[PDB]
Ligand binder design. Structure first.
Ligand code: CTS
Length: 394
């Protein structure tokens, strides 16, 4: 359904839909604030559902699932010249641990989205974004500050959930829409046992192929250096239809944030050069236009921004307030953003393509493809360039 050798992925992630993220839909978390006190705001979906109780959580989520993304969004995505969406979903949509507070019902909408994709000629990756115990401690895994995916029976439960996903979406029924199943979003390499993570990836790969599926297996790079996965799941060992997903950002440390615009561009170009040397097909499954970490709660509920020296002991660079609203951005910030977007697009089209995080947010402009496109900062058509050939690719 896709030619990874000759076609280029031009897509968007459908984040904030099946896995709640406070920075993407702050309206669902803000009612828990007491005046200016954020100490009682649930920090992730686990605590949000637990605090509300099953009845209220299901009532609020049904409304969210039925309105956040609809068929109209798929038509708009196609109309903008995109050909692909990545869909994050948590393990709890398929299986609950004993005592899990989560509610289910996401699968009905996932299945509606696959039909909307088919009707609009859009291809999809299904991405298991949160595993039991958490594979990274981020709020977007469902459970913040916990790193227990490799403890107890959590790896085994994850493989069981993947088997369910393999049988439902890796077979003939969706072979014209599903062009990859991503085994696990952003496992945090540095805090995990890498030998056990490789075994899990291999077990997932073998389990999918054993069902008779020919669907591409997508493995996230686990924050390893470029080339790390070159010798894993290789054609020499009869392992095939494998894609590496690289996520690329320059906002999660003081050093990255302090770079001037030219150095931000040089780094983006280098991502393209280095990905070209890898031996597996690869796609930039996440990236954005952000040059700051100013979006409210991007680092988590009750955490500030490094950009204004309010988090991670980073030095003050600039005030975030003036950057929260795209209408208040200076001409220089608008130009810098457009340059940054174009360099990234050129670098990612140099290999398998790109998937912007994300399609929409309630009010964080750096992270919304819709907002950036409507304000003229994201090229439309996507091949348009106001700053051509910043990287000099051959
Ligand atoms: O929203 C999250 C997404 O859920 C994760 O896969 C990590 N991404 C990295 C940038 C931002 O944190 C974004």
């Amino acid at each position: 359904a896709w030619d990874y050798d000759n076609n280029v992925i031009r897509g968007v992630n459908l984040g904030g839909w099946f896995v709640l993220e406070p920075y993407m839909t702050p309206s669902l978390f803000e009612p828990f604030q007491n005046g200016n006190d954020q100490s009682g705001v649930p920090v992730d979906e686990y605590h949000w559902t637990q605090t509300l109780g099953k009845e209220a959580a299901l009532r609020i989520l049904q409304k969210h699932w039925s309105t956040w993304i609809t068929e109209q969004d798929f038509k708009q995505i196609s109309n903008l010249g995109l050909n692909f969406v990545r869909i994050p979903i948590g393990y709890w949509a398929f299986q609950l641990l004993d005592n899990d507070p989560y509610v289910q019902g996401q699968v009905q909408y996932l299945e509606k989205a696959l039909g909307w994709a088919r009707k609009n000629n859009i291809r999809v990756w299904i991405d298991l974004h949160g595993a039991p115990g958490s594979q990274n401690g981020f709020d977007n895994s469902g459970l913040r500050d916990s790193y227990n995916f490799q403890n107890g029976d959590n790896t085994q439960v994850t493989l069981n959930v993947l088997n369910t996903i393999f049988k439902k979406y890796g077979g003939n029924e969706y072979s014209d829409v599903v062009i990859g199943i991503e085994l696990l979003n952003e496992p945090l390499g540095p805090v995990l046992n890498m030998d056990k993570l490789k075994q899990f990836f291999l077990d997932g790969y073998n389990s999918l192929r054993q069902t008779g599926s020919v669907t591409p297996v997508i493995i996230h790079d686990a924050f390893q250096v470029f080339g790390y996965w070159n010798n894993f799941l290789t054609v020499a060992e009869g392992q095939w239809n494998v894609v590496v997903d690289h996520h690329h950002y320059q906002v999660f440390s003081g050093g990255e944030l302090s770079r001037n615009i030219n150095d931000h561009i040089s780094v983006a170009c280098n991502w393209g050069w280095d990905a070209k040397k890898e031996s597996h097909w690869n796609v930039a499954g996440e990236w954005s236009a952000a040059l700051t970490d100013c979006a409210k709660w991007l680092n988590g509920v009750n955490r500030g921004a490094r950009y204004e020296g309010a988090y991670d002991n980073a030095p003050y660079i600039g005030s975030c307030q003036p950057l929260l609203d795209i209408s208040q951005w200076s001409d220089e910030h608008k130009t810098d953003t457009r340059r940054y977007i174009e360099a990234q697009l050129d670098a990612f089209e140099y290999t398998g393509g790109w998937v912007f995080w994300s399609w929409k947010t309630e009010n964080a402009p750096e992270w919304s493809f819709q907002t950036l496109t409507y304000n003229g900062l994201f090229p439309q058509p996507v091949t348009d360039r106001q700053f051509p050939n910043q990287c000099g690719f051959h």
